[PDB]
Amino acid sequence: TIFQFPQDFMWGTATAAYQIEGAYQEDGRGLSIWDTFAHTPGKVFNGDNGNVACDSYHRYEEDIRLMKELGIRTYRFSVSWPRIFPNGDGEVNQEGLDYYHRVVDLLNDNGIEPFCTLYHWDLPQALQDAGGWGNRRTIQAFVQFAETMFREFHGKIQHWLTFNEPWCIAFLSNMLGVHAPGLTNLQTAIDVGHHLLVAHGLSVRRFRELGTSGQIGIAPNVSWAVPYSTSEEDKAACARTISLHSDWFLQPIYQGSYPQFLVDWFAEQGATVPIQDGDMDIIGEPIDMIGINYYSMSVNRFNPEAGFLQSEEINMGLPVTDIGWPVESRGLYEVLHYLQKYGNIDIYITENGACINDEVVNGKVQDDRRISYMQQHLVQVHRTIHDGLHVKGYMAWSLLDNFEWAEGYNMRFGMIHVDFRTQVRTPKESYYWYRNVVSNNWLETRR
Amino acid sequence: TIFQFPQDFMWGTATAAYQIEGAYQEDGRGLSIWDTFAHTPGKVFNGDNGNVACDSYHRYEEDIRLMKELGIRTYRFSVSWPRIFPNGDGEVNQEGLDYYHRVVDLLNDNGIEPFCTLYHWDLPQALQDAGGWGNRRTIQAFVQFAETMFREFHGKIQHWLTFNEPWCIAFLSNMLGVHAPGLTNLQTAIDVGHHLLVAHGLSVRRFRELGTSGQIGIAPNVSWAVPYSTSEEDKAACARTISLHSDWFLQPIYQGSYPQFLVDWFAEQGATVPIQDGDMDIIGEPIDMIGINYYSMSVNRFNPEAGFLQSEEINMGLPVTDIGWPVESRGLYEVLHYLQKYGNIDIYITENGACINDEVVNGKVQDDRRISYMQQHLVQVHRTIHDGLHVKGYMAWSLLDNFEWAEGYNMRFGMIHVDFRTQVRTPKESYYWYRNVVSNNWLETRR
Amino acid sequence: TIFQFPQDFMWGTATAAYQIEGAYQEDGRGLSIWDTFAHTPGKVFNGDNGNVACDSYHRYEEDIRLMKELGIRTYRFSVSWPRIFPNGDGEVNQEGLDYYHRVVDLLNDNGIEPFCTLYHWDLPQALQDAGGWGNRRTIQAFVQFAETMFREFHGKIQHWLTFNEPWCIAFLSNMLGVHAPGLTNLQTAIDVGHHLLVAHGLSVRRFRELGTSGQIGIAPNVSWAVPYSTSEEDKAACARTISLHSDWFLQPIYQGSYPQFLVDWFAEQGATVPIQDGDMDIIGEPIDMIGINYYSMSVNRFNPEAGFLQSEEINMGLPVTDIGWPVESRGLYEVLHYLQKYGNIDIYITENGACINDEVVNGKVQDDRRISYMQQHLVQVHRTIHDGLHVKGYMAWSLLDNFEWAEGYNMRFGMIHVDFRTQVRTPKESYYWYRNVVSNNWLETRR
Amino acid sequence: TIFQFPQDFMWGTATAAYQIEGAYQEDGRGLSIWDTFAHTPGKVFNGDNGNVACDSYHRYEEDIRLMKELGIRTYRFSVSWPRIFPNGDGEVNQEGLDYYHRVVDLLNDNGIEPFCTLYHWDLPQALQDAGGWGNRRTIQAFVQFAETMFREFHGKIQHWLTFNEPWCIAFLSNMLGVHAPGLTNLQTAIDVGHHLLVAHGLSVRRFRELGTSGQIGIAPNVSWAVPYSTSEEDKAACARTISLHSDWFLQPIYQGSYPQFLVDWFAEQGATVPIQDGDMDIIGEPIDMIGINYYSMSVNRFNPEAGFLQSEEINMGLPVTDIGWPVESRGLYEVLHYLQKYGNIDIYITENGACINDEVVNGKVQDDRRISYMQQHLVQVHRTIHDGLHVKGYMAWSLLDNFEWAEGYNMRFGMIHVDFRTQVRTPKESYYWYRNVVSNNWLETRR
């Protein structure tokens, strides 16, 4: 089957600052909660950290040449907040801004459209010390950061995302303790989620007030669960799982309220959203589009012992990637249609990829499983476009193998292999396959 | 995840006569349309035929010992019609009956419940010469055959199936020309389908009139298609695909009529069902259960050039078995729920398996992919039971690698490897895995 | 270095009934708590059970031929209680006795001295239903069982052990829930430990009263822990670890009391030993020797969160066997010297071995690591003998790969490989190495 | 288990001049007793010599870059005496001093603290001709050498060691004849040992008088033996073995006397220490710390035929490194605690490593066994620190594979592989593992 994509479909790859930039103390960069987290014994696999990670702070020219050869039209990357404001709240670091100018100018020189993610988890440690996202003052610090970037890069960037994966930032980091700052308190997770939504709304306002170039949105990671049985309880368990990742952040944005059933659920657990007057109006600031991060899908059932959402994932026996996630691409088709509850909004698949740990053998990386994974998901993308949904682009999660939060360098998601001992880049077989798809602008599945 | 099965769940394996019995001219056996078909250049891969195929006519004792060691409770097999009535219409061949007595007694001696499939495609050539299933006289010949078996094996067999895969017998064989007798005429396919339904109804009547032991049903192969787009036409294309395999045969049986939309469809193509007065009443004879044969699932779209049903299957990029079928077990969960339109009837998964061609290496057959396939499908079985559906048992398609109709011996579906050069049996790794599942009566998926 | 052993040193191998006998329902055998445990989802790896396990109930003649060729002088095996008394408390099953007569006569015919373990964890389910070892009536049932064996095998067996690994029977099974019956209650673990000690004392009395042949003892599994730091608390943590395995059972036997510090420890946790008047006097019945089971050694430190004994084992980086136990043979030398607190009693290393999962490749099992392990431990044995300790013999843990409780068949400890699919025995390279050591009666370590 | 190290723990690697510097006749370097020894047929394996050995005389910049990337804080190296004083006793060679200035400045430029070993066995041949260390005039020559280095490198080096492994210099070289000058006379070995102790004391005095920078000590190789039996004689045999390596040199230094029992032992063999008045007072000069070289541990027994110390090492069957040494890290914990007899002095593990001969395969050196070895020994280091002992740092024996005295290039101890045919350096897998440990400052053992 041949799947032709729209003429102006935006093809790309994506990275995040702390995962690839290698110069954590260079040019006045301050420490982030992730430096702190990775530097704590037991928080990240093997004690790995982003001190060097890919060294893209120095090797960006090479990476950009590689992505130029890929035939890609956009590059999603994130800005390291502590490089711009080493204290979070403070005096601007021109050296930090200079770095992004070098990167952005090179991208633009190469016809590659920057797709800027302002917040990709690297909150300056100084702000965390004051309570981090649990403190409304951090909202102010973020707006300052956003403004600085909007003004500095006004006509160089046309695509902006305020936050990347609000669920991970709030719940995975503050309720489950898996990601920095590693807390386990429902109330603080809810506080964090609410404050980042306020920060987001204010930043969009500034974007509009400053007359900044381009479009702006937010990029939540998307969850998709299907019930094991036809029971109302399994159905509810799946609604909770799905809704906390997306609706919890999208309903306030698009409809001016948090999902009542989840508000009630958390209330049962003694937690309440710290909503101040006009917070909801600020959060409802009109956005241009949203980024959607998708990787897997699950079959769940209600289980009172299954975590704070009492939703248990069943191991259905499906084959899994090297990080253990089952691959079932229909989930992408399903959430995209599910999200239509907010209207036929513009959606970019800002992240989609697979952990496949193949290494360099005979000078190549025969990552057939990543090609397989991508192929199945791109079919779903075409399928939704064919259904009339406004899915505008796709960004392969990871141009490069990188520091994969908590997993360390152990889990490879890149289309370009990076030997962390030499920093040597080796484009995988998926890279060359992707090059053909993005350059031809059509995909073909064959037996 | 641990999946506990019901106390009385019936575990088994299945075969078909022409695929495993090796003695096509022995003990007065007459030729079937399949001997004829396989003996024709170009009809079956490599000119393979069932002349010897496994030689189970002679090696049944060994096979039965192997299935006894498997911990299985039932064995589904089919009866070679031309061994009982070498002419189809004629004088009984006691030698043919003796063979099945040897098999059945041994099964019973070993506590293995026979699950008898009367018709598994081996129509005596003599009847085909007279028009085969296109001729109503064949219905009479079949009822005689059924009666003979019912009387001969009265208290030895408690589970009976009249026909196995009516869709393949009618459409694949008479419209698509892929299986014997290899015709390509819509009207004859429809005639065949209708006549086999009449034969089925009459045989159930005889079963009841003779007071024969056990329960009796029919075993259609089940189809499952999901639409590519949300269009009404893709939806219709999938209804046609799904309905021709099951509803076309189940609606007359359970509701007294053929699916009207398919009646109209075929009428558009100039074909009409040869329904005589009381045919529908005969077909509606109450049955005890049905067998369901499931292997794969597809995503289809309407396409006017896509065959007689104008339903095109999209290659979604999913991994496939060695015969090229994509594995997606949810399809089993879906049809089982879909079939509830006929009531919560008793259903046995009379066939489910995968073509995995692994051979003997280091004295074993490391068929991990078959274990994987089975594991995923058994989860769905448990899932439907947990939903309250009366799924009574499961039979792994193929105890032994065998003559795979049209594919020849090239496509292996067995849990026991058969080296066709020596007839040597080598239980695969899936055999030992299955032995544990059927003996423990619970399954466990692990990472 | 050459290590010459004493002229009359007793060399052997060992097994346990439920781990090797394959005929759990044969000849009237009743179910044991282990059949029950293994038949419960989640209790044993992969749902493995002892239903067939080696099939030594039928293949003992082969096994005995193999051990005769090994040059061994003794064979330690256990008696399946539910084969003798299918109800535990009840009427004798002559068929069960006959089996052991076949085994024992063959051993004796081959000049191999039987070393009989009366209790090796297979308590009849019927007794467990009544409270198992938590009920003093079980003590009576055990004495009946012991008497029966003493009278039946009077002049055929000269070495007897009442219980094998009291720590595992009591604490691992009733406090930690890892072994059958799988309970987690300190008090019941203590009850079980005390009742088995009473059963042991009474059985020794009967042995003496009946004038039965040979010597009789008990075979505790031995623990050995060394402190991480020189702190009093780490030292205490190690004393608890060491003492619960051995002193807890040996002090009542040899000195008429339980280790006070452990009595106090458990008292702090609200558990008290159910000591009735004269229980201690019964337990103090003089024994002829003890069997010692040794596998590993650890370095521990005090940790309040480290289980009921608040003793944490440090992962020192030492290489481990395939089941994950570090090899450090000095621990054997240490406990043997430590046990001298009870006098220079007769000690038999009734168990010592390693989990090394090597399989048959090129017709052999190149288990160099098991040879390595054994070699290091046999040096320690010689060392203690050279120090004047009365270490009388050594039995390699496992003649055959077997059902390894909770680990299933996944963990191989045998010197003879068993392909559980064919029951085919393949003596490992360690078997041939051991044959030379036991036949020459001296060991040689070489570079 | 996670082992956190002290904030200021000093991590490093170590080498010795003759083993790595490749330019034995370059820049006026005179010959040492080792050039002479290696140039004699039969003294060193395969006639290997240090003529080129690693060529670090020319490739130091590369090596230093590699150790900078390692994250190391100190580098232990030795000074080639015959490069400074080509005659030993004579006129200074500025070219030789210049080399070390290039090395030291580069180290300092890279934040790597030089740890200078003045004497690492390369005594100028000219002095050996006059009797070498057997002649007190050599003491004077050494003090001149020491002074020169102290004055030349005053503020560039902060850590100094006078002698490296006095036992090897005296006994292995002059009693056993294995190392240069290869003599076999107890009396001369004792003379050498005493004269080097006097040289050491005088050099420390000069260090203090000149007001040189840093701290100064001596680095004996440490021995550790445990008795086979509990006999007084085996115990004595172990005391002799242990004491000759350490106490023989440390007692005069810290307590002002030689171990009396060893004085008596040698007296029995007709040898006496040539102690002149005030020699002991000079030797007792206060030192800042000591370096400890540890590799293995043994189990010994008394044996009158077992060499001059009549101490036989038993082959306990333990796994060995590629040079044949058994690995048993507890020995490090034991000697460190044993050395507390001199007070809780500052101790640096100046050497610890393993001979693992893995080569470059697939572009890497998979030296898992060296990682294993180091991991076990670093646990012991942490353990002693946790016990309150002042263990200040650890230096992995060998940054690079090198000329391994008498073994030649056949025995590899490096963390960086050196292909002696191309001089190409290839950091081993242990290098990358060590980089993580030294950079994180904590170690983790995992299963």
Ligand SMILES: O=C(O)[C@H](O)[C@@H](O)[C@H](O)[C@H](O)CO
């Ligand atoms: O939010 C994104 O998800 C994260 O930024 C990535 O850095 C993750 O590593 C990737 O999703 C794979 O888990």
Ligand SMILES: O=C(O)[C@H](O)[C@@H](O)[C@H](O)[C@H](O)CO
């Ligand atoms: O009717 C069933 O289809 C047939 O009985 C089998 O013999 C098929 O060959 C099997 O389903 C795989 O194709």
Ligand SMILES: O=C(O)[C@H](O)[C@@H](O)[C@H](O)[C@H](O)CO
């Ligand atoms: O108590 C003994 O340990 C048991 O009898 C064995 O059956 C164990 O499985 C074996 O020691 C392996 O650890």
Ligand SMILES: O=C(O)[C@H](O)[C@@H](O)[C@H](O)[C@H](O)CO
């Ligand atoms: O005395 C030290 O030991 C030596 O400096 C090294 O050069 C040795 O060769 C190394 O220890 C290997 O044993």
